[PDB]
UniProtKB/Swiss-Prot annotation:
Organism: Homo sapiens
Location within or outside the cell: Membrane
Function summary: Voltage-sensitive calcium channels (VSCC) mediate the entry of calcium ions into excitable cells and are also involved in a variety of calcium-dependent processes, including muscle contraction, hormone or neurotransmitter release, gene expression, cell motility, cell division and cell death. This alpha-1B subunit gives rise to N-type calcium currents. N-type calcium channels belong to the 'high-voltage activated' (HVA) group. They are involved in pain signaling. Calcium channels containing alpha-1B subunit may play a role in directed migration of immature neurons.
Disease / disorder: Neurodevelopmental disorder with seizures and non-epileptic hyperkinetic movements: An autosomal recessive, complex and progressive neurologic disorder characterized by severe neurodevelopmental delay and developmental regression, epileptic encephalopathy, postnatal microcephaly, hypotonia, and non-epileptic hyperkinetic movement disorder, including myoclonus dystonia, choreoathetosis, or generalized dyskinesia. Disease onset in infancy or first years of life.
Residues of the full protein shown: 1140 to 1219 of 2339
Residue spans crossing the bilayer: 13-31, 40-64
Lineage top rank: taxon: Eukaryota
Protein name: Voltage-dependent N-type calcium channel subunit alpha-1B
Extracellular domain ranges by topology: 32-39
Sequence ranges on the Cytoplasmic membrane side: 65-78
Amino acid sequence: RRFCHYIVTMRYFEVVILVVIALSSIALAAEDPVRTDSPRNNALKYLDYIFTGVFTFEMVIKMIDLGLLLHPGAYFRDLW
Ligand SMILES: CC(C)CCC[C@@H](C)[C@H]1CC[C@H]2[C@@H]3CC=C4C[C@@H](OC(=O)CCC(=O)O)CC[C@]4(C)[C@H]3CC[C@]12C
């Protein structure tokens, strides 16, 4: 399945990741600090669920494809 992981990251995947990043940044900029229970916060929290799911899916794909700290050139070998 590692070849599938390699091919998924190339199937226009960076653009989708960037779109998710931008939309989640706008979602962060749209929160209401003072009204902690207003419906806007309720919608943005669902948006945050979606963005968290997408990001953790990408992170798991990266773990599987590149491998953990066991060797250089893998996950945790970058601060990013
Ligand atoms: C090149 C990059 C840095 C562009 C940056 C643009 C956005 C990061 C910022 C600029 C001003 C922000 C907006 C300022 C406050 C509003 C109102 C906010 O809530 C409302 O619509 C008011 C109605 C209500 O409170 O119920 C929704 C998000 C929004 C559009 C924000 C969306 C994100 C915005 C567009």
